[PDB]
Amino acid sequence: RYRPGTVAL
Amino acid sequence: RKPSLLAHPGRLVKSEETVILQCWSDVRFEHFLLHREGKFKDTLHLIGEHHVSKANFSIGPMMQDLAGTYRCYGSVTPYQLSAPSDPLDIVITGLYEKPSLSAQPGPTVLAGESVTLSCSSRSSYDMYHLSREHECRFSAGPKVNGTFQADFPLGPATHGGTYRCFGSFRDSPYEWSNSSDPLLVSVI
Amino acid sequence: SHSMRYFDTAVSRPGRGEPRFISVGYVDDTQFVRFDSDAASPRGEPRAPWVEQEGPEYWDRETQKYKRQAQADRVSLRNLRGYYNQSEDGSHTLQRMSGCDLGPDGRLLRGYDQSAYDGKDYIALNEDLRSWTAADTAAQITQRKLEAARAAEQLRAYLEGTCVEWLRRYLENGKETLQRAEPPKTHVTHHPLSDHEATLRCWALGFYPAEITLTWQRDGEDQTQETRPAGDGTFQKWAAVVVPSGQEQRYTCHMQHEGLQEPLTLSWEPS
Amino acid sequence: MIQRTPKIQVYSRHPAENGKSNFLNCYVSGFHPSDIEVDLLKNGERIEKVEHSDLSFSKDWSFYLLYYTEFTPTEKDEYACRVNHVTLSQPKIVKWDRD
């Protein structure tokens, strides 16, 4: 599935 | 007049969590709308309900693009908007490794003694913030043993309560880290 | 020869307004998902009939991930446009490639999470899935914000296991579409290049998958050694060779494909 | 802000013949930024009913996109694709080779 939700870069 | 904005349950918001910005006024506005200024601005239209008049704006699930400064406005019918309410700075937390919150000389102290709270993290946070006894803002020293630390000497303002503190970077003063392990200070 | 590749792009418009986000997913050679922030109501769309059989909570969870990453990328555009002091003049691009390549066994071989800003590489996850590489100091600020979030730990857990497990699950579910082959329909063209020169092209059209070996042979040995989407899920690859005009009877195009039991010999028959 | 010149390919699904409904594919690749104005045209003027693929990129971060439409290939009708990009000082129109 899709990558986990991560913080803003 | 101005409307009256407040937060439920609070002005700080964890990620994946919804808050209720309640905007109430005695003018009996039939329309309300809520504007966010920040990285990405927005407006929300809603209907006023006469309990006093009020609207309950449901924000969430909170994410980095929803934090910022909020101001609500009242209107009748078309629009005839009011003067802005007092701003309210909704903050997003729960995004980074939580700092540590130590106490000096200890959490509980004798009556007549001061306490200093220290927030330390291996993560390179610029600022640290302290609640609640949600106001204290200090900056962080660069390195000791690879850790970044901020010291809040509470001095004359030590009365006890549960204390949490967060790490933040300077480019994003609204994006905060996880809450530290909440430390209860008692004035034994 | 098995991979799950996700490609993400967010374009910031000049001034105010949500930067448009878009993300596509490929299993091997087939696109199977897509998301677009600028729909009338944005959600995660399938792109193949073998993921439609996935449950409601699957598409729900997927869509939620896509939304959170959308807002994260828009904020990223804001911060990045703040990291180099670039005013409202200028529309920007942000791209991220996140995928996994499976090994000869049922376990991970390679993990990718690359991020580029306006065309050039910006920050990348190191091959150990624990370190990072930054292109400049701004990407070092990003590196600090990312290490503070421990996204390398989350991601290492994603690539190691979740990407591999769901790769195996997509292969199994869609072995009637992915693990089947399509033989190529062939044709050979000839163009005059000069007085004594002529170019031959070995066109293989409408085939699946992409892995195909096209070799020109003069009498005997190799001579030589791209693809494009046919539009229905297949591809087209041509093999060029430059030969002396009036000598094209000798050169023959040999072709090996998965859907072909024996290789095909193909000479230029202008009929 | 590094600009990349797009490469255009005007082909079809199957080598054409008349009596065979075919798909005209205008495939652009290897460009940057992603903002590109592509529209196919038959016998001079634009086709207003066309759909395309979803945008992605390659391992050099260069984008690629594919437009396509239904048609029948005739000896009396020409086909071409019109592409405008920031790297182009002019909208380039590329004809459909029957090859």
Numbering used by the authors:
A (entry chain C): 1 to 9
B (entry chain D): 6 to 56, 59 to 84, 87 to 142, 146 to 200
C (entry chain A): 2 to 226, 232 to 277
D (entry chain B): 0 to 98
Q: What did the paper state?
A:
While the KIR2DL2/3 receptors share ~94% sequence identity and segregate as alleles of a single locus, they are inherited on different KIR haplotypes, which has implications for NK cell function. Here, we determined the crystal structures of KIR2DL2 and KIR2DL3 in complex with pHLA-C*07:02, which showed that KIR2DL2 and KIR2DL3 engage HLA-C1 with different docking angles.
We determined the crystal structure of KIR2DL2 in complex with HLA-C*07:02 presenting a self-peptide derived from histone H3 (RL9, residues 40–48, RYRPGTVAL). The KIR2DL2-HLA-C*07:02-RL9 ternary complex was determined to 3.1 Å resolution and displayed unambiguous density at the KIR2DL2/HLA-C interface allowing for ready interpretation. Overall, the binding of KIR2DL2 to HLA-C*07:02-RL9 was reminiscent of previously determined KIR2D-pHLA ternary complexes, with the elbow-angle of the receptor formed by the junction of the KIR2D C-type immunoglobulin domains (D1 and D2) characteristically straddling the centre of the HLA peptide-binding groove and positioned over the C-terminus of the peptide. This arrangement placed the KIR D1 domain over the HLA α1-helix that was bound via three KIR2DL2 loops, A-B, C-C′ and E-F, with canonical contacts to the HLA-lineage defining Asn80 by the C-C′ residue Lys44. The HLA-I α2-helix was recognised via two loops of the D2 domain; the B-C loop spanning Ser132 to Asp135 and the F-F′ loop that spans Phe181 to Glu187 as well as the D1-D2 interdomain loop. Comparing the structure of KIR2DL2-HLA-C*07:02-RL9 with the previously determined structure of KIR2DL2-HLA-C*03:04-GL9 (PDB accession code 1EFX24) revealed very similar docking modes. Taken together, KIR2DL2 used the same framework of D1 and D2 residues to recognise subtly different regions on these distinct HLA-C allotypes, with the twist angle providing the basis of the differences between these two ternary KIR2DL2-pHLA-C complexes.
